[PDB]
Design a protein around this ligand. Sequence first.
Ligand SMILES: Cc1cc(CNC(=O)c2cn(C)c3ccccc23)on1
Ligand SMILES: [Zn+2]
Length: 140
Amino acid sequence: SGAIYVGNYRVVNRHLATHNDWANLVWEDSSRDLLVSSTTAQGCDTIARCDCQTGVYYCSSRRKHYPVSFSKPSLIFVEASEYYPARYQSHLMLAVGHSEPGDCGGILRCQHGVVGIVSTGGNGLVGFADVRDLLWLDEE
Ligand SMILES: Cc1cc(CNC(=O)c2cn(C)c3ccccc23)on1
Ligand SMILES: [Zn+2]
């Protein structure tokens, strides 16, 4: 579990969105595994605006933050899971690291801020849904 809290927005994995998230929907994209809902209180997280390929991610199944190198956001084939059939997921970055289904929502960050959240995994790889291209998260 986990979310990004920026301005009056809550960014979560679309497959973990609650009824309250859907009832207060701002934007959602199934191909990116992202859903954004509105909040009453303002958030503390800052979004990175860069093309970094190194950062640190939070792994709840180890209670640890790990430094990783990750690929640029791309269209990648993801194996079938409890939440999606086997399909191509867009704006996805991969790194070598541990992850389990429940690690979804853990933040990946760099020197400029939040880069994305854990979304996929298996076979010693961890995949992150990028949010750096969503410029509207900083305004409105
Ligand atoms: C132990 C162990 C090792 C693994 C292997 N990781 C996985 O299967 C998954 C890791 N993440 C972040 C996912 C998201 C959606 C669906 C599956 C996964 O799972 N349990
Ligand atoms: Zn950066």
